[PDB]
Structure formats: structure tokens, C-alpha cells
Amino acid sequence: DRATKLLTYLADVTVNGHPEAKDRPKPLENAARPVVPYANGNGVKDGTKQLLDTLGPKKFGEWMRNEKRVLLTDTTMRDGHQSLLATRMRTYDIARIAGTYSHALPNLLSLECWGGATFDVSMRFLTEDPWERLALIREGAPNLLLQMLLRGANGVGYTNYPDNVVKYFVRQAAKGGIDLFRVFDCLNWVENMRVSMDAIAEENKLCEAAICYTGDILNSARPKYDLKYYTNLAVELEKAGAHIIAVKDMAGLLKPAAAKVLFKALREATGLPIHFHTHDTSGIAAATVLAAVEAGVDAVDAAMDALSGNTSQPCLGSIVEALSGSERDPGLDPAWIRRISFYWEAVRNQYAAFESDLKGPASEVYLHEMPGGQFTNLKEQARSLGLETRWHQVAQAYADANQMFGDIVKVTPSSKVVGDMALMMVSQDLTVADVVSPDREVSFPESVVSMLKGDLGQPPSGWPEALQKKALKGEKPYTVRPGSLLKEADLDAERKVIEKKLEREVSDFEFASYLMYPKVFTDFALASDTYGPVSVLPTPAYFYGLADGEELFADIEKGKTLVIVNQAVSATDSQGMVTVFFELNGQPRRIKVPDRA
């Protein structure tokens, strides 16, 4: 019966394709399966997880500060495929390598493996549960910290939520295995970060409060985001309970000369340790990372080679190689880094359907300031509206829209708003002058109206009045924390709603999912009752089913491995159904599914 459901999934995808893969490039036919590397046999060295359990978060930050070596965080399991493969990487490929990280790289600070877009995408597009994913990683890497990206008041969503929801979600994330919460607000508004940061601390976990980087601190024609802006924020966040401060350079804008100045000043403005995250869209972020290291930063993020570069993080193997033998040599075996990269390479070849057409570095990023994680999504959202051929007009409009909003931090979800505005400006051939024209009726996107009303918070100098008065068409804006206006979610009543929808009790984790993504979670749970635990399928089978005659090994459970053979597939019948003829462990099964064509 879990078998019957998996067979039903295999049949269906075998018969009808997968919607996400059906009209997109296919991997190569021969395709080496990814192979988990033989680990020698050495048992697992205590690492940062054991320390954190011993010291607690405050003393752990202090240990970070004091540590001479630079500490490394791998983003391959989260930001890496978010930025290069539309976040489509599956639990099957992610979980299987965790053990290897654990044995072979016991000195990593952490694995970035959760939050950001993975929460949503995992259910909506992958038909899998992000909590299963987290538990599997936890169990694979019990010596390393596991790290999520949490969007402050926007949780793992796109809009500000009631405080009690944000609090509950953080309670479940803790219980579920997150040790290190990198938490950020899209407008760098500390007031809108206080709820999350306190909730992370109440769970006695690491609150790594981020400052999003934008602009250029070494260009005095843009004083709004100068050195003081950043150092003052680090102080404000220390006062607010951070254990760690991050610099989240979401679009890869920090340049090397600026990192030398920025990190030296930061580490003079707070005693807290500093963690630097960047993207390699410019083709020079490895330089920026090395300068950060030379200037005393405590930790840096990087991605495995095979999922590094471009809009992803810069190359982990190559940064380690450059540091090797230096004073702050981080102590990681490069041969193992390259072996895990080789697994990642083979993994990634399976996701050909989700490759973008991005060819390499672009200094254009200094102009548009599109976060790495948005770049691709937005390019497609433009392809979508027939603007493929004017991508460079969209990047210019994005820069113009940014200035029109008064020069703001653009990261989820504020980047989406600037993205909508840019797309509209181009579709409709409107300049910013046109947009704010008294004489010119403009249908602003809902998200722009909503940002200008106050729903995403407050940029440090408020929203420009003229654009605002015109966007709002008379509705009054507000400048209070958006969560202070939201009715407190009635948790007991909400639980009952979804429990009736599903005719069963749900877990607290699942409720946290419902609270964040009610429709998406509902759809996923209903899909799960039909198809069973399809996350256990290897990736080609999940996206393409089984070829004629093909044999598949699946582990429904720890004992039980299902051997499944596709023996034949019928023509479509009068009732519009197709019958797939499987052998399950040498026994014949006929599974009927619809012809969805």
C-alpha cells in the first residue's frame, strides 16, 4: 500500500511526464548515477554541533570570534541550487551526501541546508516534506551545525506574518534540527527583526542577525549606504541579542577594497563574530571573500565547485586552496572537497531541465543589483511576458525602479517588488518620469502598492511621498511594524481547519507548514495520500518515471527494497485511462492512471 502509491506515482509520471520537466532539456541518456564516495572508515570527530551543545549560543559566538582559522559554511545544499537550479534539488540527493560531509569535513562551521526558497519549493514542485529533509540531514551530520536562512518577519514566506506564527515556526525549526538561524529583514529594519531574533534566543539557538549589503561604501556619490550605516546596524543588532552578525551580500556587490574596510570596521564596532555571505555574479566574489579573510572575518560561506560560480556562491575548493598554508588556513582536506564536488556534479547533471542559459560573469550586476537568487527567476518571468529580447532594458528599469523607491535594499521579498515594477515599466514602455506623472494613469502592481502602504516595513528614510500618494490612490499608508496590525492567529482554530480539510491529526511540523503555506501544504498533503513517499525515489525516476523494460530499486523503508520493472504500457482506453504493467519483486501489478494529454 505505500508500494501501491509509489507505483501509482511512477506510472503517472511514466505515462504523462512531470509538469516541471516535460518541455525542457533532458539529461544525457547514459548518465552516470551519482555515487556516494567510499569514506575510509574513520569515525566522526566532534565538531561545532558538540561545541554549541556544550557552550550555548553566546559562548559559541565568542569561540567563533576567538578562533584564528576562518570558518567555512557550505551553501551547496541550499543557496547553491536555489541560485542555479531554481531550488529543485531533491532530498534524495541532498540527504545521501550528509554522512560524507560528516566524516570527511568535520571542521565545517555549518551546512546551509534549509529555509530560503527550499521550504516552499520542496512541497510545491518536488512533492516532498522539508521537515523529512531536515531530519535526514540531522541524522547524517550529527557533528555539524545546520543552518537556515530565515526572512525575519516573512518567515519562509513572501509577506510579513503575525508574530505568534513567526514564533511558532521558529519553535518548530529548532525542534526540527536547525542550530543556526541566519535571519534578515528585506529593508534592514531592526525593529521588524526583534520578534525572530528573540524567538531564536528563546530556543537557545544561534541568532545570526544579518545586515544586507547594497550600494558601495567607497563611492561617496551614494552616501546613503556608507560605512557608518553598516557599523551602526551591527551595534543595533548586538543590542538586540545577536550571537553572530552576518553580512549578507545577496547580489554580490561587495568589492574587495570595500571588504578590507568593512570587516576591519565591523570587528572594531562589535565584539560579536562576523559571518560573510556573497554571490559570484560579478566573477570576482572570491577576491572579496579572500579580502574579508585577510581583514579578520570569522566565517565565510562558499559552495562546492560543481555548484559554484555565477549567481551561486564562489568556489569552495578554490578558496580553500588559496588559503592553504596561510595563517587562517581553515583546515579542510581538498581532496575530499573535490570528491564531494564530483558527487555534486553527477547529482547536478540530473537537473538539466532546470539549468539557466547564464554563460558567466556580469559586471552589469553593479548596475541592476539583482540578488543572485532572483536573477534567473526574473529572466524567465520576463521571457514569459515576451521581453526575452529586452532583458537589458529590464535590468536598466530595475535600477531605475530602485532609485524611484528611494534606493532600497533589494532581497526577498523587496526584490520581487522591484522586479514587478521593472517588468511593468518595460511592458508598458514607461520611464520613471512617466510612472510619477500627474497626467499618466498607471496600474501599479499589487506588490508595489502593498510595499508603499507599509506591508514590508520601512526603509531608513521612509517611502518617497509623490510616488506613494500616487500609488495609494487615497488609501493611507502606515509606518508601524506590519506585525503590530495583524490579528493574532488563533492557533487552536487554525489547527482544526486543516485537520478537517485532511480528515486527520497533523503534526506540529505540518501545522507550521500550514501556517506558512496553507494552500501549498494542503495540496502537498493531498498529493501525499495519493502518491505516498515519492521523496524516496531517485531523481530520474521522480522526473521521468521508468523507460520500457527499465528496472528500478527503491527503498520504501530501511528493510524493504522494492524492485520495480516497467514491462509494458497500454494504449489509452475508452475511460481515458492507461494501464502500466509493473513487476514488483517478481510479482505482477497493473496500475491504471489517467491520460492527461
CB of 514 to Cl ion, least distance (A): 9
State the cell numbers at 253. Answer: 556587490
Cβ atoms of 169 and 156 within 8 Å: the answer is yes
Stretch that binds its own copies, among 4-12, 466-474, 536-544, 571-579 (CB under 8 A): 571-579
Other residues' Cβ atoms within 10 Å of the Cβ of residue 510: 21
- 116 vs 330, which CB is nearer to Cl ion? 116
User: Which of 109, 233, 290, 471 forms a contact with its own copies (CB under 8 A)?
Assistant: 290
Three-state secondary structure call for residue 81 = helix
- Kindly state the helix (H) or strand (E) to which residue 578 belongs, with its residue range: strand 577-584
Using CB under 5 A as the binding rule, whether residue 62 contacts Mg ion is answered as: no
Q: 432 exposed, middle or buried (CB, 10 Å; 0-12, 13-18, 19+)?
A: middle
Using CB under 8 A as the binding rule, whether residue 107 contacts its own copies is answered as: no
DSSP-derived secondary structure for 136-185: HHHHH-TTSEEEEEE-GGGTTSSS---HHHHHHHHHHHHHHT--EEEE--
Using CB under 5 A as the binding rule, whether residue 520 contacts Cl ion is answered as: yes
How far apart are the C-alpha atoms of 472 and 79, rounded to whole Å? Answer: 35
Three-state secondary structure call for residue 446 = helix
Which amino acid does the sequence have at 250?
M
- Pattern 156-195, binding to ligand BTN, x per CB under 6 A? ----------------------------------------
Contacts of Mg ion in 261-300 (CB under 5 A): 298
Other residues' Cβ atoms within 10 Å of the Cβ of residue 585: 12
Query: Is 78 a known ligand-binding residue?
Result: yes
Select the binding partner of residue 520 from ligand BTN, its own copies, Cl ion, none (C-beta < 5 to 8 A, by kind): Cl ion
CB of 244 to Cl ion, least distance (A): 31
CB of 391 to its own copies, least distance (A): 10
Using CB under 5 A as the binding rule, whether residue 67 contacts Mg ion is answered as: yes
Stretch that binds Zn ion, among 73-81, 448-456, 533-541, 584-592 (CB under 5 A): 73-81
DSSP-derived secondary structure for 240-259: TT-SEEEEEETTS---HHHH
Angle at 96 between CA 321 and CA 29, to 5 degrees: 90
CB of 118 to ligand BTN, least distance (A): 19
Query: Is 440 a known ligand-binding residue?
Result: no
Using CB under 5 A as the binding rule, whether residue 156 contacts Cl ion is answered as: no
- 145 vs 546, which CB is nearer to its own copies? 546
Using CB under 5 A as the binding rule, whether residue 79 contacts Zn ion is answered as: yes
Let me know if 59 is a catalytic residue.
no
Let me know if 500 is a catalytic residue.
no
**Radius of gyration in angstroms for the set of CA atoms belonging to the chain, rounded to a whole number:** 24
Using CB under 6 A as the binding rule, whether residue 18 contacts ligand BTN is answered as: yes
State the cell numbers at 247. Answer: 553580512
Using CB under 8 A as the binding rule, whether residue 342 contacts its own copies is answered as: yes
Q: Which residues lie below 8 Å from residue 20, measured CB to CB, with a gap of 6+?
A: 88, 125, 353, 354, 543
How far apart are the C-alpha atoms of 123 and 130, rounded to whole Å? Answer: 7
| Short-list 316, 244, 240, CA closest to 278 | 316
Burial code of 309-338, b = ≥16 C-beta within 10 A, e = fewer?
bbbbbbbbbbbbeebeeeebebbbeeebbb
Angle at 292 between CA 100 and CA 225, to 5 degrees: 125
Using CB under 5 A as the binding rule, whether residue 112 contacts Zn ion is answered as: no
Active-site residue, from 49, 248, 379, 416: 248
Size of the site for Cl ion (CB under 5 A): 4
- 466 vs 597, which CB is nearer to ligand BTN? 597
How far apart are the C-alpha atoms of 84 and 133, rounded to whole Å? Answer: 20
Let me know if 508 is a catalytic residue.
no
Query: Is 64 a known ligand-binding residue?
Result: yes
- 273 vs 538, which CB is nearer to its own copies? 538
How far apart are the C-alpha atoms of 524 and 127, rounded to whole Å? Answer: 6
Active-site residue, from 8, 76, 412, 539: 412
Q: How far, in whole angstroms, is CA 331 from its chain's centroid?
A: 27
Using CB under 8 A as the binding rule, whether residue 573 contacts its own copies is answered as: yes
Counting other chains too, the contacts that 63-66 makes at CB distance below 8 Å and 24 or more residues apart are 64/109, 64/244, 64/273, 64/298, 64/299, 65/271, 65/272, 65/273, 65/298
Query: Is 138 a known ligand-binding residue?
Result: no
* Residues making up the binding site for Mg(2+): 64-65, 67, 298
Binding site membership: which residues? 1-3, 64-65, 67, 78-79, 82, 151, 248, 277, 279, 298, 412
Cite the active site residues. Answer: 79, 248, 412
Annotated binding residues for pyruvate, written as ranges, equal 78, 82, 151, 412
Annotated binding-site residues for Zn(2+) read: 79, 248, 277, 279
Q: Residues in the site for ligand BTN, rule: CB under 6 A?
A: 12-13, 16, 18-19, 596
Where does this chain bind its own copies (CB under 8 A)?
30, 32, 218-219, 255-257, 280, 282-284, 286-287, 290, 305-310, 312, 314-322, 325-326, 334, 337-338, 341-342, 345, 348, 359-364, 366-367, 388-389, 392, 548-549, 567-571, 573-574, 579, 581, 588, 590
Residues that bind Cl ion in the complex, under the rule CB under 5 A: 517-520
**Contact residues: Mg ion, CB under 5 A:** 65, 67, 298
Q: Per the annotation, where are the binding residues for substrate?
A: 151, 412
Residues that bind Zn ion (CB under 5 A): 79
